[model samples]
Target: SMSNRLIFDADWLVPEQVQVAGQAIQYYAARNIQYVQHPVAAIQVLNVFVPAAYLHGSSVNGYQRATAPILMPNTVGGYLPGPADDPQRVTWPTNAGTIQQALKRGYVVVAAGIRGRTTVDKSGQRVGQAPAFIVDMKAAIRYVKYNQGRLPGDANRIITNGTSAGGATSALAGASGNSAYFEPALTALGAAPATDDIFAVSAYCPIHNLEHADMAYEWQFNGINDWHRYQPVAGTTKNGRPKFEPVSGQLTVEEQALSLALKAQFSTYLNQLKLTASDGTHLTLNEAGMGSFRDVVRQLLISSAQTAFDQGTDIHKYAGFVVTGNQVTDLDLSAYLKSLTRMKAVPAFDQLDLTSPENNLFGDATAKAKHFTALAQTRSTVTAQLADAELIQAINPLSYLTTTSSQVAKHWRIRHGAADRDTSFAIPIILAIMLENHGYGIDFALPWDIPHSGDYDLGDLFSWIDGLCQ
Candidate 1:
């Protein structure tokens, strides 16, 4: 048997009859509603109020009140997913206000505690999944209806409402209206037909698909510092002139010529290693020979290596240490190796992975530089695969939405923040749209500050509901 405990801070001004198994139990408290049986056989109607400060994380000490009329017929409402702990915790300012308004309008509302908080399974495990929340709601509705003496209506005229997360649950409950996916709680409570087709659902700000929006942006620019450091340098030049000395102190022509040549060679080497863009027209390796090749190597060096020391100790530092004028030094070799590592860590490099299926296409820079030809081939293959998957077929959600009504309506409200930050307002909007489009007597309330169901003025909402009730 599942039992519910309702807490309150005020004494009631009027007594309400809450039927339990055909027995009328009069509750006098201002806030508190409890159901003590499973598979209820009667209806229990209660004008119940729950202490606002406890359910909401507010510190108001006085009679901070919120009311909802609970019409526990032999059936129950739907399910709700949550943020792990405290699923039943109402939304900030609006939840209490909404409940209070519903009660004044003579609606029997019950504040639900989502699974895992005030209740646990027989094995004492907390229900944290989407299915669990949904199933529990279904059971609560059934318990109220079957409990006999509990509620007043046909047991099917039940509605669920919440803002933000609560709104999300309400939306999901409606979207997943068909009970083919009856959660475990529903099964435990006895399958009363999963297709209850929730009468109505109202949500405020809701959390919808966040993987593409939240995660993608967070990982892209959270820690990047160097923006344009990967670019290559241009060509180099040589200094031909030499420093002149007094005739008495000057050496022979041979020594002077050697010094000048060395200075020119060093300058030439520096000029040759200047960087350039990969697609730059001037410096192709095939046309420019050693100088072009050296520039390419230097560009690779800057791309992979983090700093001079990170390049390792292999490349020769001084031109005088090179035994052959044409030979590359160990320092150059080391810089090349280090440069490979740095490129692999770049954000642009990782973006390539999302575009294709090649395993580790942007592996550490060292490997990429060492095996540039192979890497290029792999990248090309992966890019082709990705392009085909993305372009040849529908891979994104938007594509899927265009074809499926369920997905289209479900996501629309999420994008707009219809209710609180936790509920998707799309569900109600979609419902209203479908009905209106079908020539039903339904109209939408476009409130200025309202994003979800509760965002609008209750007076306006009740006026609409009052018309519908008739």
Candidate 2:
């Protein structure tokens, strides 16, 4: 009953029995399938994972196969190019990745490798930059949709997942779909004619909205000036050095003052959002940058703290939290940010020196750093004009969700690790609020202590997918 619409590529799907998510299973893997046309097509190729439910008529975790959802998960991080991780095997050496975990749950998985800012051509020219990442992701979706009848699972039920920079790309893929803005790039790259719209979006600590990340980061971390670099290894450095060192996250006085200015601007930006929380309350930030919006954020933090307490965490470990009885009653925002820690300077993402990873991401061929934001260009010593507005608009998820025209994903699950200060908590929250306002099914939260990562909770994530598509 389950078969692909068409074998478009020269390579054929191979039958294989692989161990995934601690279980041995049989499935079809169409590896190295090219999803696009030009320079280094291999970089744009994708790997397809058909579930055993479709190939062998069997299922995992009691989930049936006949009509399962397709999970299109990318491995893009920091907007850099990487190999296409195979979904049929354990992505992590110690555990299964999201793709394999989804296969175990009777969901077809597409692990695609798209061009990033660093991808280069045979002539050594950078081919993947700025909007290329999002464009390529959309093209991969179009590829899956184009082969509709040939693909095993329901293409219409496609869902996406990623983390950090990859998480931002995943959100972009979900937010902007079939919009005329990207049609030129898609057509030039020979993308499939099918629509690229997806069913749902799941992101983990997405590092996005580069143009405004500095402002948000400063808003949350203005008071803190001490930055520390910590490793998972306890009491030891790479050279096995002793003492827990705090040698990073420092800011200069000028940078500190800049942080204050940016923080002040955040409230204005928050008011501009004009978002509503689930309880029919308008979220606004006062001149002091505290309002119903801050309340929503506080409530989320309290809710997570309460959950942690129930699960055996001491809310009073730091003595700053206000816990009543067995519940975490409330917490101060300043104390929270001081503990979370800041990772960047006054202007975090779009650096004035044109050295941030984001600058490279939006860079052109052979040029390492290009200005994507006006503030970055104006402030930088190496003077330059802002890049085209289209490039800036292409990478922004809010660009689509804020407008009424785009066919955005109906369901969204956005998570930022409670303690992850790599960027502002407000970034993901704003993204969620925007999507929620646009009438989408959103499951937004700050998981207890996820950190800057993705695919952490396969169980909960797949369960949400099943609930939507089942």
Candidate 3:
């Protein structure tokens, strides 16, 4: 019951001052606070950072204590547990640090630590498995909501941000808000008796929809079985810096066949998805994945290319892109594949060997990894069993987005860089299109030349959040 005593003690904050953006600013920090009554792992904790002006019941950048937005930025990646964020030690290299930038803008920042697949109890029993991260995230959000008026920021205006797997977590949390699907886990964890719904979501390169990501990956890079993956060099550079080298190779005949098989399945899935673009164009893929879906993909590339050329970047480097009168006339899929070479193998997420992080993510308390998709389970190279259907559905945001009962976030900002090879462009594109089709306010774009990173466009992100908060 000690941990379940969900109350925000205003005097509990440790007053601290730091210099951000060439100006001295003061704020209060709370660290290692428990969000649940009976936590299973040490990672199930959160930290809060609030601007001094906000706590003092004043205004900063036109936002008062009760009116300011609560920014919940996750540090998860590769489905790994994340440590609580400390404002005193701002080490984020992008945009002068994510938390510091939010604090500077008078946004109350809550960095909730989360459990992942590899987490285990003191007795070596696996506890942080499928639905663990999302459940933990929901519990943390509920904690804030329970303390609503007592907390510095407006709990109803909670906005989540993350990159990669964390981006996927943000989107999942945004979509599964207040859904009864997570009630059992939340109740077991003794979470606060409050709604977990959020105001908005900001995701960067989110790798979600795991059950079908491999098919989507193959649909985007079917013929390009040859891999050009970048690996970190064993030794550091002469200047004591880390470096990477490209390792090139091609897939075997069997793997190539597998790639084609996976590609073939995507057309069926996409056609059945029944999504539409903003212009009411029916998004469908043919047996070869060449249809309105390809048209949408091409248009995304054209828009990115046109923006880059207008900004003085050389567009001729793209071999498959045809540029006439400084406008992109057409695109050759084969030529474009040369630029965005395959970074993953035939089956990307749910590896047949049960070695991918996603496999572990869907595993149970005993199994370290399990196949989450039927294709991977059928063609498994190991004795890995298929994950429970319910567990797999629980982690995928797509499962909840279509349901009327789910309180999905009204505002969504998703950015998957155009040059990112970590996952298929189709993943985020499909998510955004689906969200748009559902009548949610979503701003989705693939920033030109950016790849597999977040917070690079903080100015735009903060501006978007500010506009929404107002």
| Candidate number of the best lDDT | 3
What range of 10 consecutive residues in model 3 has the weakest lDDT sum?
87-96
User: What residue runs in model 3 are displaced by over 4 Å at the alpha carbon?
Assistant: 1-4, 90-96, 230-246, 403-406
Better of 2 and 3 by lDDT: 3
CA lDDT, every model vs. true structure: 0.33, 0.76, 0.85
The sequence of per-residue lDDT tens digits that candidate 3 reaches over residues 1-470 is 55358777777788887777798778888888888998999988888889999767688888988889999988788888766666665343222277888988989998888888888988889888878889988999999999997888999999999899999999999999987889999998899999999999999999899989999898888878688777767864443334778887888887899899999999999999988876887899888888998888888888888889899998666567888887878888667866778988868899999988888888887788999889888999999899889878878888877743438989999999988889989899989988888888889898878878898999999999999997
> Per-residue alpha-carbon lDDT of model 1 for 1-470, expressed as tens digits?
43332222233334444333354433322322333234222221233332233233232222122222232111111122222111122432224345444444545455444442213345543333233344555555544445323333333444555444454455445444443445444655453332444444444433322112222111212222222222223443243212333222223343334333322333333334232333443332222223453454344333222233243533333221222443433235323222312111211222323321111221221221111122223434244222222221121122232123431222222222211212112223333444333333433432322223333455655554444443
Worst 10 residues of 2 by lDDT: 1-10
For model 3 the local lDDT of residue 293 reads 89
TM-score to native of every candidate shown: 0.38, 0.90, 0.95
List ranges where model 1 is wrong by over 4 Å: 1-94, 116-126, 189-195, 209-446, 449-456
Q: What lDDT score is found at residue 40 in candidate 3? A: 91
Write the candidate numbers in order of decreasing lDDT: 3, 2, 1
Give a tens-digit lDDT track for model 2, residues 265-360: 888877887888778788998777778888888888888788888999765543347878887877887887677666667678877778777888
Query: RMSD of each candidate?
Result: 25.8, 4.6, 2.5
What's model 1's TM-score? 0.38
